[PDB]
């Protein structure tokens, strides 16, 4: 099931290389970056979407993620499912475990402050995430069964906005260098 949505943002900091690719397929070479996110996926996030995708390169100089990412508003919330990540695993205030895609994620929210929000203001805004607790493998067919990770965050009073902004599979990097190749659907 296609994509529709280009998730191409940088901080503008160092290099970051975003192609375009074949449908759902997209990679990035960066180098020396900032912060800046890159992905395929679809414009408006679904809590019942089942994403597929496979990194056909996964290969962080540094600090990455290849994560689930996307938006709601009201609430406002920046949300991740990180599959897998370079030199550094993110994480924040532990809310739990949930098991899904034959993976275990931890469960954590952060609150970002003075950070620009998709909306471009720079504002306060609650994170949530599931981390994987292992790197997933990559460069196989992988699920991100989402209704999952929305249902275990919900039990932590970790609500998702009603407001779905983008939902993709992303390339995130921080102060890094690196090259993905993921193709999602």
Do not use: C
């Amino acid at each position: 099931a296609s994509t529709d949505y280009w998730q191409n943002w940088t901080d503008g900091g160092g290099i970051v290389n975003a192609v375009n690719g074949s449908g759902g397929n997209y990679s990035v070479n960066w180098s020396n970056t900032g912060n800046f996110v890159v992905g395929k996926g679809w414009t408006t996030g679904s809590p019942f979407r089942t994403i597929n995708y496979n990194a056909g390169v996964w290969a962080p100089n540094g600090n990455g993620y290849l994560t689930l990412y996307g938006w709601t508003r009201s609430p406002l919330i920046e949300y991740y499912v990180v599959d897998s990540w370079g030199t550094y695993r993110p994480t924040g205030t532990y809310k739990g475990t949930v098991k899904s895609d034959g993976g275990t994620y931890d469960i954590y929210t952060t609150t970002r402050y003075n950070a620009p929000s998709i909306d471009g203001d720079r504002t306060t805004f609650t994170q949530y995430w599931s981390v994987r607790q292992s790197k997933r493998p990559t460069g196989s067919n992988a699920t991100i069964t989402f209704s999952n990770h929305v249902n275990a965050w919900k039990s932590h009073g970790m609500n998702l906005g009603s407001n779905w902004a983008y939902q993709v599979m992303a390339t995130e990097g921080y102060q890094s260098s690196g090259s993905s190749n993921v193709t999602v659907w």
